[PDB]
């Protein structure tokens, strides 16, 4: 059959509204890992097929099938005979079927957490950016078109939106926010550390006792033409111990089982390793951006002092004390308005807020 | 069954808005290679069928089927007997089933990257073309029809849109853009090099040790009537080594397996080679266009100096110093407006911007 | 099952807007050949059934089925025995299964190319007919109904649309178009040559070594009652060589296989030959029309000089010098407006353009 | 399963707009024959079942099934033994499975051609009736309701629609139409001859060597209770020659096969013969109508001279010379307006055109 | 499975607009007989099952199944032995499977014809009732609600609708209609005779040689408890002659086949006989209504002379000569307006037409 779900993918992939730069790789990460996880445990609707001997009546084949899938499997390159005891034969032991498809779902969830941390944390800070942005937005969606306001366009932002934002600041500033920028940079630290932990989980996945995977080694093998049977690891043909019961208890034998899933798993561990290390390095530089921002803060004002330089007629109020009134809170939320509404609609907003800021400072 | 997906193909094939010339062969390339890849690994919902001997009970047939698919296969033209050892029989060894259907998906993704590079890079440059184009666009969609503005049509562009664009330039020009044209031509260099690398991946695909494919050789064979068995390569009937286990370990035999997929794969490697070399040569000339543009830049102004020659009443301001004010940034974004909105609506815009450009120069 | 796709057929069959006369046989050709191709390789969801002898266990039947389909088949009229060697038996050898269903898809694509050549070429010429036609169109869709403009109807075309068209000509005429008519007639030459090449591909299809098909011979046989077995070619019952492997290598035998597809293929090669030769002869006369047009050009003006003869009040400007101003470019685009908008709405447009043409000549 | 397609049947059955009287039996003919054809080759999703002897293993049953379907079948009434040789047994030979379901599709197409001839031919004539009719139509759809125009209703047709039609005549009359009526009557001759040829194809279908079908003979048999086995023709139980291969080559035997399709085919050849002869005789009288019309032409004016007799106030212009101005072209297009818009809305149009016709004559 | 089609049943069952009294039993008749016919030949997706003896291998069971269905079957009450020869055993011979399900479809079509006769015939008469009724209808749908016209309500019908109808009469009366009432009563004669012929076809169906069916006999048996086996006719268990072929030719035997369809067929021949005789007697009285109408015609005016008796203020014009002007044509179309629009909206129309009728008489 075929399964194509457009809508549910569009829910996370689209619906929640933000343009946040490359923080939307949480949005797409959840989709990739969620779809891969839900696809693998779907078993491509036979995971494993086996050689079980002549006289089994085919209700046992459908048994030794699972009993090989559930109980572990192992591998030996072939011609070593079987070795002996339980050890030298079981030395290389490949069962990651138990982990991978579920631990991916867990991965995806742990990529979704940081957004939740940011929503709950901004609701803790007291000043909600979602409402403000969606407001000044549609203010800019209405009268951008209307020709009645252009020569007035500057004075239009003065009354209606700028009093809304500048009014929200008065309420928030009395409740648990001069700090909301700091809360944001903690959110992005959590983003980075989360990414690296996920990557490390990919590495330590499979089993650390038998190697570990990271891409340029595997591609540095395949592209040398080492396949599997001559590389000594990661096989597609696995022997399977097997146990009946009689008054002689164990009665174990070895039945080799061709193994399909191992053709997918290491075709997508070459991709998904590159893509997770990419999400890691693009998420970790975004963090140092904001520690730099939070630290220097004298060059955090370059964008605002830049917008105030266009400033038709440049009326009166001085520069510094405007930052004295706006400094802790608004200096951030402006860096948010520029990121969503665009650039030019923000400059009008921050040049209007300079005119009406008196009573507060 | 039948799978027909119109919508998801229309998402990439349509939804993101641009007319960029023959840069939309990334758009269609992703569709061709993505659909081919997703179709091949669908196995036309039997990849390979085999001759396995008389006494197997049909749970082994369904085994030696995979065990032949997963483990490699090879080919010998027939009547050579089997030769001997492991080598002369395995000399020509055909397994590209492992690579092709997945490496196509990887291809498609690597065709989608350059668009991403251009979006992220224009967001780095500071001046967003998407917003501007979509703005002056619907400005031209509203009052193109309205009869109240025609004798005023020139003066209409003066106030409303031209102040928007010409205002965006003031903001961008202070932040990391005189260069956005250079960023664009780097994007197109990446486009070309990406295309040629993809083509080279097609060539080196299959296995370089046993020939390599490029079209006029294969068609230069088929159209001479060489099929396969007499051309010595690329078969549809492949022998398959096979291994049981007993106290005598290997016990290998040879079971020839009719092989269906090889009827598709080299029907679409004749097409897809031509089509990739075409995308290559149409993408590589588009690049030299922009290096020429970026270099000479005295003949990059021919279109603007051309629009200013229609110029009703040709009021006052001289020619050169207009380019002195507009030169680095706007000279590009105009070449973008002409490409999307059409030609005639752009000439009005660039003849209006000449009138209101004073304060900035 | 049943597959009925209305929408995707309506996309090519309808969506792209033009009335171009019998150039829409590219539009319908792509549909016929694409649907036939996609239907044939669907195998009418058994291509071939065979007689394979008594003791095969039905996993071999499902093998010799393909091994007969993939490896070639041949035919002998029956009672000749088998002849001998490999030659006299294989003299008539029927395998076109490999070619036909795919080479049809290739056909369809090569019918779609010329439209692409025309779009890209008109975008090279500098003056876009699509925008202009869709503009003066909906200008004629709005105020055709409105009763306020009829006595003014002539003066209505004067201001709004005619300045748009006549303004586009000023821009184009400075960039790489006096020639757009020539580009068009090259497009139609490509149309004709493309058609004849496709037809010739039908002929040389099957195999030229064993006859070739063209309709009045086949119908000139069937309607004489020659079927197949007595006509010596084109059978529905084909013998199939077959090869096992043992220490005696070849072990070939002959197993006759009833062959279904051959009932479809030559029911639609009687139709599709007629229909391609029709598309050829209707496409090739359309070409000589435009070479005649491009050559004489004194009788290319008959339609315009005809429209200017209705001409209420026939004000002032002389005849010839109007053509001197309009000659190279507009004389074409008018022959385009007449073809899409209809006839009477074009006459108003070309009688209005005579009034406002002064400044340009 | 069940297949019900409403929309595609509604496309031809409805969408193209015309009321043309009983020329819409092309519209419905295409539907009947197309649906019958597509239903028969669907095989009622077993065409033929057979008696094949005891020891065949059921992969041969599924062979001799087709090999009987593809290779011909014959019939003998039973108890004649088998006769002998190849002739007396094969005398009556029933295979129309090869022809019927496809030749119906061909039929349907050849019913659709004449409409195409009429569209292309009217586009050759220069004056498009589709646009005019759809125009004066919605002119009559708008202000039929509006109460502001009734006492003015006559004067309403004077300005807006009548100048449109009467203006189109000026353009057409200069290009290849005084004749469009003649083109129409050639179209209807083609209609009639096409119908009779189709009917004759039904007759000569099956095989002329063994009888031929026309209804009152078959019903004149069935309703006498002659079924098949006693009527000597048209059986439901057919013997089937069959050929193996051994060192004795032919080895033919006779295996009688119950035959289902023959229960449908002559249930719908009783219907479809009546219905085609009806379409023939209703289409052939429609033709003599228009040859009469084209010939006498003094009584072709009875409808117009009839409309001019209601004529409130009957102002001035004489009768004959109005026909002198309108005679060749408009006299037809009026007989078209009466057929689509109805009758009363046409009389207003032709009584208005009498008032404004001066300048043209 | 399940098949439920609402829309296609609603097309005939609803879409064509008329209230014609009990002439809509053609509308519902077509649905009943069409659905029954299409359901029966669907075989309730096994028509007949049979006892065929021990040693048949189940590819013969699936043969003797059809060979019993196609070739006839017969019946004997049981214990008579088999009798002898071919006659006494085959005396009662039940095969109506061949006829019934198709002859029902033919029935339905022959119920649909009379509507077609009426549409074509009214289009022959020259005055189209469909347009008029649908016009004065929506005239009554608009201003019935509007409160501005009530005291004016009488004068409202005077200008707008009544001039439309009374104007159509002037055109029609000059072309082939004083007679349209006569055409209508011929249509209803055809309706009645058609109904009785259909009923007689039900009777003579099955086979007249073995009884015939009409309801009160069958129910007069079942409700006496005569079932089948003791009533001597109409069985559910039928013996089936059967023929192999050997050098002894016939080799016929008798294999009794349980027969399911016979449980449906005479459950719905009890219903459908009553329902057809009802449609007959309700359709035949509707006919004598109109012969009475057409004949006396002095009491055909009772409804109009009745409406003119309400007549506010009863202005001037006498009674009889109004009928002299309206007599042949309008006297009918009024009896049509009363049947569709209702009664009270018609009285206003016929009291308005009395006021404005002067010029015509």
- Structural domain span for residue B340: 127-175+301-361
How many structural domains comprise chain C? 3
Q: Give the whole-angstrom CA distance, residue D329 versus residue D332.
A: 6
DSSP-assigned letters across all residues of B21-38: TTTTHHHHHHHHHHHHHH
What lies within 8 Å, CB to CB, of C179 at 6+ separation is C125, C328
Residues E53 and E46: their CA atoms lie apart, in Å, by 19
∠ at Cα A119 (A118, A125), nearest 5°? Answer: 85
- CB contact set of E172 (below 8 Å; sequence gap of 6+): D343, E125, E126, E127, E180, E329
Report whether C361 contacts C324 (CB < 8 A).
yes
Neighbours of C82 (CB within 10 A): 12
Say whether C310 and D170 touch across the interface (CB within 8 A). yes
The answer to whether the Cβ–Cβ distance between C245 and B254 falls below 8 Å is: yes
The encoded tokens of residue A130 equal 């979602």
Backbone angles phi, psi at A335, to 5 degrees: -60, -20
C171 at interface of B, judged by CB pairs closer than 8 A: yes
Q: Which two tokens stand for residue A351?
A: 């040049």
Q: Is B54 helix (H, G, I), strand (E, B) or coil?
A: coil
Strand residues in A149-275 grouped as ranges (E) = 237-238, 241-243, 252-254, 257-259
Expt. technique: cryo-EM
CB < 8 Å & 24+ apart, contacts of D225-233: D229/D77, D229/D78, D230/D77, D232/D77, D232/D92, D233/D92
- Within 13 Å and on the Cβ side, how many CA atoms surround D245? 20
- Chain D residues 272-311 with a CB less than 8 Å from chain E: 303, 306-307, 309-310
Do the chains A and C touch each other, judged by at least 3 C-beta pairs below 8 angstroms? no
Name all chains with 3 or more CB-CB pairs below 8 Å to chain A: B
CB < 8 Å & 24+ apart, contacts of D11-18? D17/D130, D17/D134, D18/D340
Angle between helix axes C330-340 and C129-142 (nearest 10 degrees) is 50
**10 Å Cβ neighbour count for C58?**
12
Please answer whether residues E351 and E316 qualify as being in contact, where contact means their C-beta atoms are separated by less than 8 angstroms: no
Q: Detail the DSSP E strand segments found in E43-200.
A: 48-50
Token readout for B52 is 């396995």
Contact E304, E334 (CB under 8 A): yes
Please enumerate in sequence order all residues whose Cβ is within 8 A of that of B14, keeping only pairs 6 or more positions apart, or say none: none
Q: Residue A207 has what DSSP assignment? A: B
Is A212 found in the same domain as A133? no
Residue numbers in D near C44 (CB within 8 A): none
Q: Is B313 on the interface with C (CB under 8 A)?
A: no
Specify whether the CB–CB gap between E307 and E350 falls below 8 A. yes
SS3 D74: strand
If asked whether residues E241 and E350 sit together in one domain, one would say no
Nearest-angstrom CA–CA distance, B169 and B132 = 11
Among candidate residues C266, C36, C51, the one with its CA nearest the CA of residue D98:
C266
- Between the CA of residue E146 and those of E134, E143, E346, E348, E349, what are the distances in Å? 19, 5, 18, 16, 18
C270-286 core/surface letters (b: 16 or more CB in 10 A; e: else) = bbbbebbbebbebbbeb
Q: List b or e across A113-145, with b for residues whose CB sees 16 or more CB atoms inside 10 angstroms.
A: ebbeebeeebeebbbebeebbeebbebbeebbe
What secondary structure does DSSP assign to A105-144, as a single string? HHHHHHHHHHHHHHHHHHHHHS--HHHHHHHHHHHHHHTT
Give residues with Cβ within 8 angstroms of E97, minimum separation 6. E47, E69, E261
Among E70, E106, E174, whose Cβ lies nearest the Cβ of D263?
E70
Q: Which residues face E252 on adjacent strands?
A: E243
Check residue C140 and give left, alpha or beta (phi > 0: left; psi -120 to 50: alpha): alpha
- The packing angle between helices E100-125 and E25-40, to 10°, is 150
For β-strands C48-50 and C257-259, DSSP reports them as antiparallel
**E65-101 as b/e, with b when 16 or more CB fall inside 10 Å?**
bbbbbbbbbbbbeeeeeeeeeeeebbebebbebbebb
In terms of CA atoms, which chain B residue is nearest residue C120? Answer: B21
Residue C99 DSSP label: T
CB of C350 closer than 8 Å to CB of C334: yes
The residues near B329 (Cβ < 8 Å, ≥ 6 apart) are: B127, B169, B172, B173, B177, B178, B180
- Helix, strand, or coil here: E261? coil
SS3 state of residue E118: helix
Q: Does C146 touch chain B (CB under 8 A)?
A: no
Q: Please report the DSSP string for E202-244 in residue order.
A: HHH-SBTTB----HHHHHHHHTTT-TTTTTSSS-SEEB-EEE-
* E198 and E328 part of one domain: no
Same-domain check for residues D107 and D38:
yes
**B150 interface with C at CB cutoff 8 Å:** yes
| Strand pairing category for A257-259 and E252-254 | unpaired
- 3-class secondary structure for C262-291? HHHHHHHHHHHHHHHHHHHHHHHHHHHHHH
A and B touch with 3+ CB pairs <8 Å, answer yes
Closest D-chain CA to E7: D6
Strands E237-238 and E257-259: antiparallel
Longest dimension (CA), chain E: 101
Q: Is D31 exposed, middle or buried (0-12, 13-18, 19+ CB in 10 A)?
A: middle
Tell me whether residues E123 and D21 touch, CB distance under 8 A: yes
Please report the residues numbered 223 through 252 in chain A whose beta carbons come closer than 8 angstroms to any beta carbon of chain B: 236-237
Contacts of D175 in chain C (CB under 8 A): 303, 306
Distance of CA A174 to the CA centre of its chain: 35
DSSP codes, B93-111:
----TTTHHHHHHHHHHHH
Best CA proximity match to C17, nearest among C125, C135, C127, C97: C135
Give the position of tokens 């047009």: C293
Closest Cα of chain E to D344: distance in Å?
Answer: 6
Closest C-alpha to B184, from B307, B78, B336:
B336
Q: Does the beta-carbon distance from A150 to B159 stay under 8 Å?
A: yes
Query: Is D344 in CB contact (< 8 Å) with chain E?
Result: yes
User: CA A182, CA A171: separation in Å to the nearest integer?
Assistant: 19
SS3 A267: helix
Q: Considering CB atoms only, which of B5, B63, B164 is closest to A49?
A: B63
Q: Are C99 and C195 in a shared domain?
A: yes
d(CA B353, CA B358): 10
- Among D21, D49, D347, beta carbon nearest to E171: D347
Long-range contacts of C290-294 (CB under 8 A, 24+ apart): C290/C184, C290/C185, C290/C188, C291/C185, C291/C189, C293/C181, C293/C185, C294/C181, C294/C182, C294/C185
Boundary-marking domain end, from B272, B300, B328: B300
Q: Are residues C281 and C309 in the same domain?
A: no
Rg over CA atoms, chain E = 30
**Cα C140–Cα C144–Cα C147 angle in degrees, nearest 5:** 150
Residues 6 or more apart whose Cβ sits within 8 Å of residue E255: E50, E51, E52, E53, E64, E68, E239, E240, E242
Contact E70 D267 (CB under 8 A): no
The strand pairing partners of A207, in sequence order, are: A210
- Alpha-carbon distance of C242 to C71, in angstroms, equals 9
Q: Number of C to D CB contacts under 8 A, please give it.
A: 72
D310, D198 contact by CB (below 8 A) = no
Indicate if C337 and C323 belong to the same structural domain.
yes
Give D-chain residues touching C61 at CB under 8 angstroms. 59
Find the closest chain C residue to B271 by CA distance: C106
User: Does C218 share its domain with C267?
Assistant: yes
Structure token digits, residue A174: 């009395």
| Residues in chain B closer than 8 A to C164 (CB atoms) | 344
Q: Is C185 exposed, middle or buried (0-12, 13-18, 19+ CB in 10 A)?
A: middle
| Phi-psi group of D262: left, alpha or beta (phi > 0 → left; psi -120 to 50 → alpha; rest → beta) | alpha
**Statement to judge: residues D109 and D232 lie in one domain:** yes
**Resolution as reported, in Å:** 3.3
d(C-alpha C53, C-alpha C61), whole Å: 9
Q: Is C159 on the interface with B (CB under 8 A)?
A: yes
Planar angle of CA D306, D309, D314, nearest 5 degrees: 145
What are the beta bridge partners of residue D207? Answer: D210
- Which residues from chain C sit within 8 angstroms of residue D160, using beta carbons? 147, 150
> What are the DSSP E strand ranges found in chain C?
48-50, 237-238, 241-243, 252-254, 257-259
Contact assignment for D150 to E142 by CB distance below 8 Å: no
Identify the helix (H) or strand (E) that includes residue D50. strand D48-50
| CA B76 vs CA B212, B234, B240, C244: distances in Å | 18, 10, 11, 14
Task: Give D-chain residues touching C50 at CB under 8 angstroms.
Answer: 63
Separation between Cα atoms, residue A330 and residue A166, nearest integer Å: 8
Cβ–Cβ < 8 Å for A282, A71 = no
Question: E167 at the D interface (CB within 8 A)?
Answer: yes
Residues B171 and B208 grouped into a single domain:
no
Kindly list the residues from chain C whose CB atom is less than 8 angstroms away from the CB atom of residue D71.
Answer: 236-237
Q: Are residues E23 and E142 in the same domain?
A: no
Alpha carbon dihedral D297, D301, D303, D306, in 10-degree steps, equals: -150
Strand-pairing partners, residue C239, are C74
**CA A56 to chain centroid:** 48
Specify the residue for token string 């993704």.
Answer: B109
Provide the chain D residues 18-37 that lie in CB contact (below 8 A) with chain C.
none
CB–CB contact C59 B54 (8 Å) = no
Distance from CA of B31 to the nearest CA of C (A): 16
- Please say whether the beta carbons of B149 and B143 come within 8 A: yes
Phi, psi of B360 (to 5 degrees): -80, -20
Contact criterion met (CB below 8 Å) for A33 and A104: yes
d(CA E29, CA E110): 10
The reply to whether E271 and E288 lie within a common domain is yes
- Alpha carbon distances (Å) from B295 to A211, B72, B182: 53, 53, 10
């Amino acid at each position: 059959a075929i399964n194509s779900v457009n809508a549910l993918i569009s829910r996370v992939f689209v619906q929640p509204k933000g343009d946040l730069a490359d923080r939307l790789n949480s949005r797409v990460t959840v989709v990739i890992l969620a779809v891969s996880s839900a696809l693998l445990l779907s078993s491509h609707f036979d995971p494993i097929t086996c050689w079980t001997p002549a006289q089994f009546n085919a209700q046992w084949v459908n048994f030794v099938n699972q009993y090989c899938f559930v109980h572990g499997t192992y591998f030996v390159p072939l011609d070593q005979q079987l070795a002996f005891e339980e050890e030298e034969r079981t030395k290389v032991s490949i069962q990651y079927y138990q982990w991978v498809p579920y631990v991916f779902a867990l991965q995806a969830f742990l990529f979704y957490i940081p957004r939740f941390i940011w929503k709950a944390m901004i609701a803790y800070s007291g000043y909600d950016l979602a409402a403000a942005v969606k407001y000044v937005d549609r203010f800019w969606s209405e009268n951008r078109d209307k020709d009645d306001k252009f020569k007035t366009r500057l004075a239009a932002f003065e009354g209606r939106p700028s009093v809304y934002i500048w009014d929200g600041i008065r309420l928030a500033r009395k409740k648990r926010s001069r700090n909301m920028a700091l809360f944001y940079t903690l959110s992005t630290v959590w983003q980075a550390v989360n990414a690296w932990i996920q990557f490390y989980i990919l590495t330590q996945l499979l089993d650390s006792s038998i190697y570990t995977l990271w891409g340029p080694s595997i591609l540095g093998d395949l592209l040398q033409g080492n396949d599997w049977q001559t590389t000594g690891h990661f096989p597609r043909i696995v022997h399977c111990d097997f146990n009946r019961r009689r008054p002689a208890s164990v009665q174990l034998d070895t039945v080799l089982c061709v193994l399909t899933l191992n053709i997918y798993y290491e075709k997508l561990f070459i991709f998904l390793w590159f893509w997770l290390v990419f999400v890691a390095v693009v998420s970790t530089v975004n963090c140092f951006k904001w520690i730099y921002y939070l630290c220097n803060k004298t060059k955090a004002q370059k964008t605002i002092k830049n917008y105030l330089s266009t400033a038709p007629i440049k009326s009166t109020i001085s520069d510094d004390q405007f930052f004295s009134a706006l400094g802790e809170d608004g200096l951030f939320i402006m860096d948010q308005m520029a990121l969503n509404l665009g650039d030019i609609p923000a400059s009008y907003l921050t040049i209007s807020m300079r005119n009406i800021c008196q009573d507060f400072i």
